[PDB]
Amino acid sequence: KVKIAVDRNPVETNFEKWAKPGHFSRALAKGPNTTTWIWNLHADAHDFDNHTSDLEEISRKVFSAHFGQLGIILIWLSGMYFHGARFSNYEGWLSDPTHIKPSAQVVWPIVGQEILNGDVGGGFQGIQITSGFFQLWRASGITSELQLYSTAIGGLVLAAACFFAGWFHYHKAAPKLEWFQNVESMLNHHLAGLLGLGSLAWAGHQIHVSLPVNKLLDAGVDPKEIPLPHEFLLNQSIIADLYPSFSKGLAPFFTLNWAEYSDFLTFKGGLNPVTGGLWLSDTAHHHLAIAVLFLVAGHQYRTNWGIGHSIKDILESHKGPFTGNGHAGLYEILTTSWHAQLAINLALFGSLSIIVAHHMYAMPPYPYLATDYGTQLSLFTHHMWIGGFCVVGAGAHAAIFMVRDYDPTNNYNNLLDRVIRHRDAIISHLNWVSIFLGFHSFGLYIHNDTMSALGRPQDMFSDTAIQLQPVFAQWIQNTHFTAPQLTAPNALAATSLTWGGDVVAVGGKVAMMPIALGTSDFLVHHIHAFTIHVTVLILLKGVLFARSSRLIPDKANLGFRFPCDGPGRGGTCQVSAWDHVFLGLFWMYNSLSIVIFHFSWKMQSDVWGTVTDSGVSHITGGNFAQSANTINGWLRDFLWAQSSQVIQSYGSALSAYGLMFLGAHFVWAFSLMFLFSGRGYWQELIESIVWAHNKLRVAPSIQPRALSITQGRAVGVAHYLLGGIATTWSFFLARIIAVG
Amino acid sequence: MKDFTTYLSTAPVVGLGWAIFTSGLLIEINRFFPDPLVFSF
Amino acid sequence: AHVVKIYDTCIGCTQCVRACPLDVLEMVPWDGCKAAQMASSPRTEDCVGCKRCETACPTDFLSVRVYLGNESTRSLGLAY
Amino acid sequence: DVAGLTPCSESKAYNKLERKELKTLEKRLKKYEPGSAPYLALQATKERTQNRFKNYAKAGLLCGNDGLPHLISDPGLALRFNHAGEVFIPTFGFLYVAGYIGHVGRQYIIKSKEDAKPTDKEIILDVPLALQLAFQGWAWPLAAIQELRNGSLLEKDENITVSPR
Amino acid sequence: MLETPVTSAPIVANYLSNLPAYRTGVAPNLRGVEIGLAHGFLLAGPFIKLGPLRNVPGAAEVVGCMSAAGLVLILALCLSLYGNAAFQSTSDPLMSSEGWAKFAGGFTVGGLSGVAWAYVLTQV
Amino acid sequence: PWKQPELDPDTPSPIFGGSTGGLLRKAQVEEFYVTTWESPKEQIFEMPTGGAAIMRKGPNLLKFARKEQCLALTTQLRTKFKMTPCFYRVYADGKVEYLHPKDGVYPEKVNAGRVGVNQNMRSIGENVDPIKVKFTGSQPFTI
Amino acid sequence: GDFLVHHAIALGLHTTTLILVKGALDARGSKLMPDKKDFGYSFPCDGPGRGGTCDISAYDAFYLAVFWMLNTI
Amino acid sequence: FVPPAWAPSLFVPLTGLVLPAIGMAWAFTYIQKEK
Ligand code: CLA
Ligand code: CLA
Ligand code: CLA
Ligand code: CLA
Ligand code: CLA
Ligand code: CLA
Ligand SMILES: CC1=C(C/C=C(\C)CCC[C@H](C)CCC[C@H](C)CCCC(C)C)C(=O)c2ccccc2C1=O
Ligand code: SF4
Ligand code: SF4
Ligand code: SF4
């Protein structure tokens, strides 16, 4: 049944459509007459659901666009490896990773910007990078710049192959709709080969290449004296005296004596004291177990050989008594609607990015990663923001699916229909819990600020006056600290040092130490829960009320992206689901800004710092237990106590950060009149400017118009988010580089 | 070719070409005349 | 209630009535246009002021005009 | 000595700023071996700083109480005190280039409005015509004032769209 | 229109039925008395728990009890304001004007009684 | 139309479960709107107050709290199946008023029977300035 | 620096004046809204027709000029 | 002339508690009054 279905040469590879910009849609096919057309040309460019009603052509376009994005990502990765190969001090950093800062960007001396090439150490000048590529290459066994050059060349070759694949699988051999709709085959192949085989290949690379190089690096020998990875691969003597179980030569794997592999497949939890990172043997056994689990999971769905489960049968069988038709029409929804799959993928990918940020601030899975505070902070913040953007786009594309691809004929008494049927109760209860959370968190903060300003330190909700200690979090921390003691007896230590235990430090700087949770921690965690709850409320109100409401009963006919329904019914501005996503973008920005502020203050006060003979001296001296309970404490002891490096960065290599900082503030301001104002004022101003250009006979043939209301909202939210993210990026990086 | 030439005749491509030309001219002027502020010879 | 006013520049294209989401407009016989139709608003108390009729008007400026003021239960679009 | 500003050559704080910049450049330079690329880059930066500080002097530049040079603004005062090239001549050059750009754009608009569908020519540029007008704008002020003289520069208000009163 | 097992359970209906607000037939003053007693008794607690003088022995209870009684007085005033604003014009007698006024009088009487009961219960 | 149809509350409702965007307390205090149609066959449609319902083969009656919901359902049925429905308005005292097909031929047509009201016999922009009508209660567009 | 901030003040004054006189001169009519006198001084918009007409009244021009005046002061 | 020492102890409670309460009660009766 499952087979390859490909049409041969449906689209001719010609440049005749490159001359005409607007060609994918009939509205833009007539040519431009106003300036908004140009914006429309850059707005509906990749809205393939609007260009054609045929699902096969949309699927082919999606396949080729994914190939193009993979080629772009591979070009970027090859550029990263090339920058590490030539304009970097990676070889110098490998000798002493605790004293030379990682740098991989070198500027050209043109107008005095050569001061940005700071003294990172190792006889090199450049920009101190915070991406952690040095630690990743050290974890991968990369020693010389020749390996980075070869990786860059291979990445460029693979990017060219991906671009050729996109061109080929669109223009030459375009897969049919039946090829894309084989969801069982897609899931089986992705679970077995895309994830399981990739995990097995990375585990094999770790076992045969990364583990011996990392062991010799931790032993303290010179990187040039380390044998090349192929010497470990071919001649078994070096890997045999580095790991005695390799002397057996694949015997314990087939004889089921896997315990003999315990030397290089370990379960020693915690961090390696030599480098302050996760044990490479632990990661090797981890990726091996992941590969085995995904290989098992990839043989679940029936494709062509009788055995295996059916997704439609599984969905139709799971029907409870309180839900009517249990998961009935969802199989037809997710095999016909690209936007529902996009919503699911974006939600899970954003959540996965959040887990990634949390679980690599917690366990640094890279050698000399925790010592670089700036790298850890930048990675956490970056993965955080990518996850937040992806989970906003999840609600956006779910609302798009609800507007466009929803069919009431296939959804009568299923789960989606019942969710629509009690959306008002859902939104009302979510609104109530959002209000309650906002009151009992932010009002607690305001209460602390007032009773601090009223001279009542005993009336605060602090760690000394009224202890609202996180008893559940503390109990979970104590249980996970005792996880290797009773419930995981084969683990040598705890899975992380955040629960408790000793302090792991590398090079005199704290790699990882136990994190204490107090009243301020409970306050900020409940604040984060409140902000996430409000963002969920906004996005769910956008999704569920995208089709109709009591206010507007024909909102589905207006489309997903419309500005308003006029000033009727008192006014219906920002009533669309797109406007709901536009509003929720700011709430996501506020939520993740508070989250990363809590992260930065918490690691700067209670985790990061230096280790002396007397004890651990943190960066901010542990003020989070006493200053994070008030908004004034966040203003003074976090925003004013820090950010002094950003404003004093002038005349140093960090000055561009401060420059970016100021520019970021500018962009954050420049968005506001796109967020405020309207369109009629700018249209009349443009009319006056048109009169001025008509007096001098320099009026353009293309009529200039003001930006659309949806376009103005999009420009405002984009510039606002860019300004805020760049402000936090510049402030965080300058503060964590100057004193970190 | 003429389809490709009209593609390069589009506004973003000629804008990119103008931006590259102007940026290169200003950068080479500032490099070969380091820090110009006062119009003197 | 809001005020809906229709002028003689209407061409009787029936676009304002089709765009009306509350059945406020109507077409009456006329002699001032080629189509022999003229828009009328006999149910202006049910109008909310959404200005959907003005969006569908093909003539330059507007042959139909909605003026807000004196909001009621029906004009505010309230289901409660 | 106008506006209570000392010349940069005879100034005091100008020398303090120069020594401070040379001192921090030498402090950065001493951390590298002489036979290294960062050493050469820092030496080039120090040479550029010294050349900039020398060229800012012996050019009539004035600085007041901070060593940072000040620009004399009023023409006539700038003309009689050797400060015309500070802002009087740069605005003349900028006016020349800005009028070049405006005249080239005006010529392109006028020549592109003649043919059918001028918006296509606006959004898909005629590169040979644009380059021909680019190299024909070296005498923009003469042409501009002559179109002003013959009235083709201005449009009559009867033919210009006017907002209702 | 969307009935739920939560909103249509017999146990939920019986629990809502015997409440003073939804009682079958009871004079509105008795409903107000029960409402004031229960709500003042629960309101006295947070006022004596974490008041401004919670650390002072003896003063905490009396300060919280008078705070609860004052809050009961403001609640009765707002109840009378709602009764005058909503039922100024013209079959349940509680929703009537004088019925709601008697309900407000019973509410303040019951609130004062509940505050006094909380005082004499926390004193022993 | 030729004879105005009368509302029949005994006509069966379409197959639908519970509703949340349905009738509020305004229905029992103020007017509420009722849409009736004559489905030739059993088919599934989408209500403007929630999810999806199935209309019965024969007379179908639905209740809404707003006239906009009634006209949205009317135009959905007319565009999807060419149903030609009609809705009434029922007040608190039970007064039934016929709303959508006032002459029975829909407002897109003319029928040569309606009288044009609220029409200005001057062009737009020929209205007097607001200074001309001051302290009189008459708007420039109302004359 | 005093001259630069004075020129910035001149920018603020000129821009606030530009907003206010654009609101005042186009108060009774414009190309987008010829009949703005019939809609009074403070009306929200004309709806999404003709491309979008939000913040077209002179009151909204004043309300933007309040932001600009706040920035200038 | 000179107010007594308990004047701040008395006058601020009225204008802070019972004067806004009386004004709000009167205004709330004013809004909802029908003919
Ligand atoms: C300018 C107006 C104004 C004034 C004069 C006050 C005065 C007061 N408020 Mg404040 N308050 C105000 C506005 C004002 N408030 C506003 C606008 C807010 C909201 C932002 C608050 C929020 C607020 C909180 C959250 C709290 C106060 C409290 C207090 C008291 C301070 C502590 C004290 O003296 O305990 C004196 C305590 C006594 C018991 C002495 C008697 C005074 C009582 C409270 C008034 C009479 C009670 C009432 C009428 C019922 C009594 C019936 C019967 C027994 C006669 C004091 C009575 C605290 C308080 O009263 O604790 C509960 C408190 O916790 N206020
Ligand atoms: C085990 C086989 C296998 C493997 C490994 C993949 C791998 C992939 N698929 Mg695919 N898929 C498969 C079978 C497989 N597929 C089958 C059988 C079907 C039909 C039911 C599909 C249908 C399908 C769709 C519809 C889409 C994908 C996409 C993707 C990419 C996901 C993005 C990612 O994780 O980046 C990982 C990236 C890398 C590891 C970089 C290297 C990528 C190399 C060049 C690919 C090598 C694997 C390839 C399948 C080998 C056979 C190709 C051969 C003829 C040359 C990834 C490259 C998405 C896509 O288009 O991405 C471009 C997408 O939208 N898959
Ligand atoms: C994808 C992951 C991966 C890869 C590539 C390897 C590869 C290797 N490991 Mg490793 N290993 C892995 C995972 C992996 N292992 C895992 C998960 C474990 C468990 C912990 C181990 C444990 C382990 C141990 C303990 C040892 C190895 C050893 C080896 C080597 C022996 C090869 C062998 O016998 O395999 C079987 C390989 C083949 C049968 C070859 C494939 C067939 C060829 C390619 C056919 C070519 C035909 C062609 C068309 C015709 C010629 C073409 C020409 C004309 C151009 C080899 C370098 C041993 C070693 O280093 O000693 C040398 C050793 O001691 N490994
Ligand atoms: C920091 C700025 C800020 C603040 C405080 C608010 C506050 C609010 N917005 Mg908003 N929001 C903002 C900016 C802000 N907004 C911006 C710029 C946007 C544009 C994207 C939005 C978008 C937005 C959406 C889309 C939604 C909200 C919602 C909310 C509510 C949050 C829910 C809650 O628990 O509130 C509680 C109230 C507060 C936190 C305000 C401070 C309360 C303090 C502690 C005073 C406590 C009471 C006080 C003592 C009484 C005073 C007495 C006095 C009268 C005498 C609340 C009314 C949501 C809503 O309606 O409710 C869920 C909602 O859905 N907002
Ligand atoms: C690093 C140098 C630099 C840079 C980047 C700029 C950048 C800018 N200048 Mg500035 N300027 C500079 C130096 C600089 N200036 C100097 C040194 C002077 C002399 C003191 C001026 C004097 C100046 C004026 C007088 C004007 C600008 C304008 C502009 C802006 C738009 C130019 C334009 O429309 O394109 C190029 C020009 C066109 C496409 C159209 C041609 C219009 C020009 C200005 C007319 C030239 C001929 C005219 C008849 C001469 C009399 C001018 C009149 C004001 C008296 C732009 C942001 C203009 C502006 O901001 O307008 C809002 C403007 O009016 N500049
Ligand atoms: C070359 C074409 C051209 C010409 C001759 C003018 C001329 C004029 N404009 Mg206009 N303008 C233009 C393009 C042009 N503009 C474009 C593309 C925009 C959109 C950004 C504007 C936006 C604009 C505004 C918002 C305003 C003016 C104003 C003015 C007047 C002041 C002079 C000046 O420099 O303003 C400054 C002009 C600018 C800063 C715009 C510069 C835009 C780019 C950088 C220049 C484009 C050059 C073009 C690509 C060359 C094409 C050559 C061809 C061979 C390809 C003057 C009548 C002002 C006015 O009404 O004064 C009475 C005013 O408020 N213009
Ligand atoms: C300012 C503003 C405008 C006016 C702005 C418009 C029409 C967009 C202008 C875009 C310009 C043309 C982008 C390019 C700017 C420069 C010419 C490009 C850089 C030039 C240098 C490289 C030389 C709106 O139309 C609008 C609409 C809806 C809500 C808010 C607003 C709003 O705030
Ligand atoms: S949309 Fe305009 S022109 Fe058309 S029938 Fe209505 S009022 Fe007349
Ligand atoms: S504003 Fe809307 S409801 Fe009113 S007459 Fe126009 S289209 Fe109909
Ligand atoms: S035109 Fe603008 S202000 Fe008016 S309803 Fe639409 S979005 Fe709102």
Residue numbers in the entry:
A (entry chain A): 12 to 751
B (entry chain J): 1 to 41
C (entry chain C): 2 to 81
D (entry chain F): 63 to 227
E (entry chain L): 56 to 145, 160 to 193
F (entry chain D): 51 to 193
G (entry chain B): 516 to 588
H (entry chain I): 74 to 108
Sentences from the paper on this structure:
Multisubunit Photosystem I (PSI) encompasses half of this Fe in its three Fe4S4 centers and is a target for degradation in insufficient Fe conditions, which reduces the capacity for CO2 fixation. TIDI1 (thylakoid iron deficiency induced) is an iron starvation induced chlorophyll-binding protein found in multiple green algae including Dunaliella spp. isolated from coastal Arctic waters and hypersaline ponds. PSI and PSII are each associated with LHC proteins for increased absorption cross-section, LHCA for PSI and LHCB (or LHCBM) for PSII. In this work, we report high-resolution cryoelectron microscopy (cryo-EM) structures of PSI-LHCI supercomplexes from Fe-starved compared to Fe-replete cells of both D. salina and D. tertiolecta.
We used single-particle cryo-EM to determine the structures of both D. salina (Ds) and D. tertiolecta (Dt) PSI-LHCI supercomplexes from Fe-replete cultures as exemplars of the native state (hereafter named PSI-LHCI1) at overall resolutions of 2.9 Å and 2.1 Å, respectively. The density maps were better defined around the PSI core than near the detergent belt, consistent with a higher level of flexibility in the outer regions of the complex. Three subcomplex features are evident in the structures: the PSI core, consisting of all but one of the 12 PSA subunits encoded in the genome (PsaA to PSAL1); one crescent-shaped LHCI tetramer made up of four LHCA subunits (LHCA1, LHCA8, LHCA7, and LHCA3) arranged from the PSAG1 (proximal) to the PSAK1 (distal) side; and one LHCI dimer (LHCA2 and LHCA9) on the opposite side, together accounting for all 6 LHCA proteins encoded in the genome. For D. tertiolecta, we identified 167 Chl a, 1 Chl a’, 13 Chl b, 42 Car, 3 Fe4S4, 2 phylloquinones, and 42 lipid molecules. The poor resolution of the D. tertiolecta PSAH1 and PSAL1 subunits precludes identification of associated pigments, Chl a201, and a carotenoid of PSAH1 as well as Chl a302, Chl a305, and a carotenoid of PSAL1. Although D. tertiolecta and D. salina are separated by ~253 million years of evolution and inhabit distinct ecological niches, coastal Arctic vs. hypersaline desert, the PSI-LHCI supercomplexes from the Fe-replete condition are highly similar, underscoring the high conservation of PSI subunit organization and antenna arrangement in the Dunaliella radiation. Although we did not undertake absolute quantification of each of the subunits in the Fe-replete cells, we note that PSAG1, PSAL1, PSAH1, PSAI1, LHCA2, and LHCA9 were captured in the proteomics dataset of both species, and indeed these subunits were found in both Fe-replete structures. For both D. tertiolecta and D. salina, the arrangement of the PSI core and the inner LHCI tetramer subunits in the PSI–LHCI2 supercomplexes is almost identical to that in the PSI-LHCI1 supercomplexes.
